[PDB]
Design a binder for this molecule. Structure first.
Ligand SMILES: Nc1ncnc2c1ncn2[C@@H]1O[C@H](CO)[C@@H](OP(=O)(O)O)[C@H]1O
Ligand SMILES: Nc1ncnc2c1ncn2[C@@H]1O[C@H](CO)[C@@H](OP(=O)(O)O)[C@H]1O
Lengths: 337, 335
């Protein structure tokens, strides 16, 4: 069997936060929500790892980029576009880019440009727009027994955390909001907010990780947000077999939610929120007329319920699996007055 | 005295392979149809270096190391325009200037985000079939097009038999002309039986035809009014506090340049070559704001501009407003 196609999702690299902790004076060195130099480096290094895997080891891809061999689509954010660019600088590094004339580089250092398309900001394919995402949570997650139970457990800490941090803390949603800032602060070696013990910071961060993962332990929530992309990736695999597409790889540059929603849709939800440069690959193998698929998440194969002891299933089986998921969550349409 | 505070820029992409094949030739391009070639990457990279010398070294509008959220880059939904923008930005902010953590990326590359429109957007280029539909309606039956057609028509049968491709109008001449332009740019031999004289005629008609389309301000406005308005709005946003960008950059096509120049009433006489570019420059001297328009390295005098190729931003706004009013559509109700 030979690897013939891969579809990949990444989360972007280290970024600045979206929000500020009111009672802290953190300085990030880049604008809110932008990819940091560390984040660029993380994605670049992931690119180098992917070169060793899909070029050196499997030989799916060549050492010098072939035009129209990789389709890259990013959400409409700076961090996801720059993350894809940075990753591709590792996958096809300086020294491998094209020459003109007598072996003179097209671009100094033989950089290799690889096109990245973006969705519109309004697209729901790679990420739901933030307010639409929160609306799904309000409807399907916040009143769930698991969310309410965890809320009751954590609630005795809300008043204290609110007075320490300044930011409103009146539910797990607010804990998650400030938790992201604390995660960024820790990733950048910043001091704790005054009056927030390491114990308290650890608890807030733990609740944040728990909460993000809990959202997608619902296959329904996962499908609402991720059904479209999951279907599209499987269709990419099919197009690699049916002659429709000549791409060796499709790469969707996305977010924590992108990874959570696809894993959750497939019935293998994550127990932890994806860290920076987390990544998922659907690998398609060919042995004669037999086509098989494997699913890789952060460097380890994942066993879908339909897979064998070798973490593998036929593409036909994956199709049937996805079809059943689509039917399971199909909406009953109604007419109106 | 007066200082440059903002620039809005359009480029055409760099050298590319053709869209079509000449039926009776066997050209091999080295990349897929319509993709940017290595020479095209080089052209855009070199333009980037030129833009660094101008807007960083000379005017100091931009800093030597990229500031996040300082440049907004929007490309049409094509590989050649995205790769052209990326190549240009590799010249504007070259290796050695990118961020450190020890370099964030080897050779200190500097990533700069590029957004793309959807393929169905009409902002930077009309989708091809919609573009041709505008030509059919407004250009192909115009007196100038018909006259040129009659002059060239005695050559159609011969060109058709030589090339294989259908040649029954100037539109077909333009179609094969692009292939001949690409062939010449890549030093390929002429198709058998096509003399250099004939190739020159076909290419000349192609250049003439592309420019002729946009000598109509109406045609230009239909396709380019939206982008022209948007670029002027970018200038206004640099003054009114709405935007903190130092530059907006629209990565586009020959049509993008033709339509904006044509909308502003300064249509080009020749079709834009690879890496052609246009800049709207905004200057501040106290409370006085002035604009200049640059095309392929030379200032262009709008009718509203003075001997110094300059006008106030207020004047530019009034000018654009009058163009909008001129081409406003009379709406109707229906049964
Ligand atoms: N204040 C905000 N504004 C816009 N998007 C936000 C946001 N806060 C969070 N997000 C989004 O919610 C996801 C889970 O934390 C994030 O994933 P990423 O950090 O982008 O992987 C954001 O997309
Ligand atoms: N066969 C084709 N398919 C799609 N777009 C095409 C095309 N032939 C020409 N174009 C488009 O028409 C413009 C003027 O020649 C081109 O400008 P550029 O070469 O992209 O600057 C194309 O966009």
């Amino acid at each position: 069997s030979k690897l013939i196609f891969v579809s990949m999702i990444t989360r972007h690299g280290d970024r600045a936060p979206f929000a500020n902790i009111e009672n802290a004076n953190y300085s990030w060195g880049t604008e809110l929500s932008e990819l940091t130099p560390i984040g660029m480096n993380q994605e670049y290094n992931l690119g180098l790892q992917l070169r060793k895997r899909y070029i050196d080891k499997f030989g799916l891809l060549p050492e010098h980029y072939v035009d129209q061999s990789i389709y890259v689509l990013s959400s409409h954010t700076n961090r996801t576009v720059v993350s894809a660019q940075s990753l591709l600088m590792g996958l096809y590094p300086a020294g491998t880019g094209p020459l003109i004339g007598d072996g003179d580089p097209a671009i100094k250092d033989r950089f290799q440009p690889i096109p990245i398309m973006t969705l519109s900001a309004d697209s729901r394919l790679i990420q739901f727009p933030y307010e639409q995402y929160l609306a799904v949570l309000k409807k399907y997650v916040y009143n769930s027994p698991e969310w309410q139970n965890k809320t009751k457990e954590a609630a005795p800490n809300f008043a204290k955390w609110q007075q320490i941090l300044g930011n409103r803390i009146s539910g797990l949603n607010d804990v998650i909001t400030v938790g992201d800032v604390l995660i960024v602060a820790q990733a950048h070696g910043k001091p704790l907010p005054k009056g927030l013990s390491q114990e308290d910071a650890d608890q807030i961060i733990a609740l944040t990780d728990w909460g993000l993962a809990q959202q997608f332990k619902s296959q329904k929530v996962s499908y609402i947000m991720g059904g479209k992309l999951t279907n599209r990736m499987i269709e990419d695999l099919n197009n690699a077999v049916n002659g429709k597409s000549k791409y060796k790889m499709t790469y969707y540059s996305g977010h924590a939610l992108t990874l959570l929603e696809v894993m959750g849709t497939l019935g293998v939800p994550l127990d932890t929120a994806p860290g920076y440069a987390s990544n998922l690959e659907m690998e398609l193998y060919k042995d004669g007329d037999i086509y098989t698929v494997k699913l890789r998440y952060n460097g380890k194969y994942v066993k879908l319920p339909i897979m064998d002891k070798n973490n593998s299933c036929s593409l036909d089986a994956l199709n049937k699996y996805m079809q059943s998921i689509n039917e399971k969550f199909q909406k009953h349409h109604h007419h109106h007055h």
